[PDB]
Amino acid sequence: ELDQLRQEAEQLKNQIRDARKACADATLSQITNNIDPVGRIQMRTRRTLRGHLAKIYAMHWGTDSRLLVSASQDGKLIIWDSYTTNKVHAIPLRSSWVMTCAYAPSGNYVACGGLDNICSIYNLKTREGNVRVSRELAGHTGYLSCCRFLDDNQIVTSSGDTTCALWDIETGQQTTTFTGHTGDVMSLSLAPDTRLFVSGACDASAKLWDVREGMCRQTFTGHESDINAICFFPNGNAFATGSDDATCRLFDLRADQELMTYSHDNIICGITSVSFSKSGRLLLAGYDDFNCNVWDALKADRAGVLAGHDNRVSCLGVTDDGMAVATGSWDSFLKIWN
Amino acid sequence: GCTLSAEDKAAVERSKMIDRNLREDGEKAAREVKLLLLGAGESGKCTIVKQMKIIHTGIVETHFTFKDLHFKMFDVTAQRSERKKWIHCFEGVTAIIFCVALSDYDLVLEMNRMHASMKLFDSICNNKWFTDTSIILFLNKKDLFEEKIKKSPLTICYPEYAGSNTYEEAAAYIQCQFEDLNKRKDTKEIYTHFTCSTDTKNVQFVFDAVTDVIIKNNLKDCGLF
Amino acid sequence: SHFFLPVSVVYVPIFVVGVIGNVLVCLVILQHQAMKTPTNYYLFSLAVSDLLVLLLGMPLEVYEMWRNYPFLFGPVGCYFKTALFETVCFASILSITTVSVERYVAILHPFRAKLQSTRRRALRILGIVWGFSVLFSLPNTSIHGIKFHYFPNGSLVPGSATCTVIKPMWIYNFIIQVTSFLFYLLPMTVISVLYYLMALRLKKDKIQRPCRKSVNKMLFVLVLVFAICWAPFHIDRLFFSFVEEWSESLAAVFNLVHVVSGVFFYLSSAVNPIIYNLLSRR
Amino acid sequence: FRVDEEFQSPFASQSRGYFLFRPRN
Amino acid sequence: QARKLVEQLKMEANIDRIKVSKAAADLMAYCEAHAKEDPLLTPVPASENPFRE
């Protein structure tokens, strides 16, 4: 009786796609020609952060926009001061193989998951001068792809075992687990309201998840390859997915369909990280061509190119106020861009 | 040091001490060698780590020393969904230990376990990240395959194979065909060895292989290779 | 004797090979600049120094063969040219010595050369070696003088001046002897014994064995040609020492020794970049 | 031509007989 | 397994759907409303920018 249910689900999906295409008569690319397109945008390395000995895979920005955390494969998690280029905290990791970072909105908690799927959390504000381990989360069966801090108490994680679950630092167990994605999830993005979030799976599908309800709200399947990175629009109504087939797509939560795509024939390398500015009109993305490119969310044009990285760029983070952008590549170098 | 402040000097001193500690740890981390393990099933990775028995979910690290050199293994075949997503993490490694059983072809685990191991070795050799890093081949089952080859010939697993039915010729053919998997790979060389009862021989072969790989890398660095 | 046609006919292919080798070195250095090792930076510096000495020798050599007196070059011009030539030669030989010693300590202690990512230290080392070469070429260049045209007629010189060593012969001879000995006995012995220890180590270590044998034979031939090419430049200065004997036949054989030393040094500077970057295509 | 420039064997010009090419130094 | 996917495909109809034009208009309105506060769109002087050369 599985075949008839599969056919019914396929018919329902086809009807949903037809209903979405019926209301998709207008395109964003045909309306953006009226508004004045942004001119040429150039950015230079404000400060070159030195002190890493391995590839930098992920980074996060704090609410104060002054401290950033970055992980290297050597096993050292360094917290950098963006203004003075100073290492305020450098902590050793039990597992040198680390693939993600996280910075709590309060600014006292930092978490970094890796291949050992142990989402070790650290308390920065302690009685002693040195930072110590707070908790270890080993419930996941796959490598932690990305971890994000919902608040000081709760933390949501994304692991290589095609399931994602939010954790409690005090408890240490998964209260809610999302297992709707069949493909491997690679990145995680939190909304400013923290009420909902989206993740990008390897099945060319990024779905909406609820932190409170714990169910799959809406699933967006508009890509042709695996989704390597994902970011959320500051407005809260849309979000962008950075896949590995050199294209980016901005999906709308209310429209439940791909509003428009960012496709350029010159670039053929996939996207490792996707970020957004304060307003959201300018979204940034890092490609495998050893440099990250600046894209326009409305006009869909390459506004600028940020070169100067010796190796491939992996992480890309923008501050909350949008003052500067930190770009991290595999050359063990962190660069701050205006 | 044109402008000096209290908190500024404190932060500068803290950053200098942290950088010194990081340089010391990197000097300590670079002295040891990092070698990857690819089991291709639960038959190979367990054999290489159990013979040494000396130390000091997810991947495990077996840190053992030999001849004043620190070795560490990474068992990455425990439970993984997609391999292509985390192979770039091991792009910079000293060597790669690939353990495969000789008599695993008779068991199916997708049409043939030996064919699956061959395709995995091909995907590993053809990876753009493991082009410079060499690969060490280890054969977990030696006497078991020598006893099985008498009753079960090799022609069932390989129809194109032609030759005698002795264990030596079959092992030589398997070694040659495994050395054939690489395509346009000259910077890296494959080391093939057969596991025996005593662990001293395996540890000595591993140490010699890592030493030769380090010597070749140093010669390519200085420009003598 | 004075011969301009054979000197130019033998220096043209040498200069062509030198500039081609420098262009090839620059091309292979530009490719994969991030993956370039500090040894590749040392080799690039050596190639730039070789180009500098080649473009300082060949034009000056053909101009001297055309006219012994400098053309449109005053005393400060000769001073600067001699200083630049001497410091470039010193930087070349000293960078060769540092390349030898770093290869020795790397093949003897691979873990030591692998750790700490010794890249900026190599830049500081090459900078301090260039500084030492400048500080050593400054005194040897400061001791230089133009006597005069020195004809007991007329009122002015007929545009005849030489950029020779007019300072007292004893002081200049002692300086040249000290420089020649400190640049032959010490660094040649260093590069010989270090590469010999490397040869013994690689022979004790030994697809792999043919590579080691090729490395050993190339080491032997490289030290051989290095000795045979840096021997004339110093046998010339030793012939300057303690024996002047101004005559016609001794002057002729001295000029022959000088020109053969010059062509040997030119071919050495032309072959060094192509012989040092033969193992690695990058 | 004794009233010429040099008219003598010792002269900085070529074809003198003494050391014509200066040392490389 | 199959029932979970059945309910997941069935719950997609209850969500209200709006026109893409209204969503695009809201997006560009939010973009132009915070464009002045955006430091990346319009460069700020060095006196106000925390990052300087």
Numbering used by the authors:
A (entry chain B): 3 to 340
B (entry chain A): 2 to 57, 182 to 234, 239 to 354
C (entry chain R): 42 to 247, 258 to 333
D (entry chain P): 1 to 25
E (entry chain C): 11 to 63
The authors write:
Neuromedin U receptor 2 (NMU2), an emerging attractive target for treating obesity, has shown the capability in reducing food intake and regulating energy metabolism when activated. By activating two GPCRs, NMU1 and NMU2, NmU peptides are related to multiple pathophysiological roles in diabetes, metabolic disorder, inflammation, and cancer. NMU1 is mainly found in the periphery tissues with the function of regulating intestinal motility and smooth muscle contraction, whereas NMU2 is predominantly expressed in the central nervous system and elicits a response to food intake and nociception. There are two subtypes of structurally related NmU peptides, NmU-25 and NmS-33, in humans.
Here, we present the cryo-electron microscopy (cryo-EM) structure of NMU2 bound to the endogenous agonist NmU-25 and Gi1 at 3.3 Å resolution. To facilitate expression and purification of the NmU-25–NMU2–Gi1 complex, a hemagglutinin (HA) signal peptide followed by a flag tag was introduced at the N terminus of NMU2, while the flexible C-terminal residues of the receptor (Q356-T415) were replaced by a PreScission protease site followed by a twin-strep affinity tag. The overall structure of NMU2 possesses a canonical seven transmembrane helical domain similar to other solved peptide receptors of class A GPCRs with helix VIII unmodelled due to its flexibility upon activation. Compared with the inactive structure of NTS1, NMU2 adopts a fully active conformation on the intracellular side that is stabilized by G protein coupling with a remarkable outward movement of helix VI (~10 Å, measured by Cα of R6.30) as well as the inward movement of helix VII (~4.5 Å, measured by Cα of L7.55). NmU-25, the 25 amino acid endogenous agonist, forms a short β-meander structure and the conserved peptide C terminus penetrates deeply in the entire orthostatic ligand binding pocket formed by ECL2, ECL3, and helices I–IV as well as helices VI–VII of NMU2. The receptor and peptide ligand form an interaction area of 1214 Å2, and the C terminus of NmU-25 (form F19 to N25-NH2) contributes a large portion of the interaction area (930 Å2), while the N terminus (form F1 to Y18) is accompanied by ECL2 winding alone to the extracellular milieu, leading to the outward movement of ECL2 compared with NTS1. The last four C-terminal residues of NmU-25 (-R22-P23-R24-N25-NH2) form multiple polar interactions with the receptor. N25–NH2 is anchored by hydrogen bonds with E1273.33, H1854.64, and R2886.55, while the positively-charged side chain of R24 forms a salt bridge with E1022.64. Residues F19 and F21 of NmU-25 pack against each other through hydrophobic interactions of the side chain and insert into the hydrophobic pocket formed by helices I, II, VII, and ECL3, while the main chain of L20 is stabilized by forming polar interactions with N109ECL1. The αN helix of Gαi1 in the NMU2–Gi1 complex is rotated by about 25° relative to that in the NTS1–Gi complex.
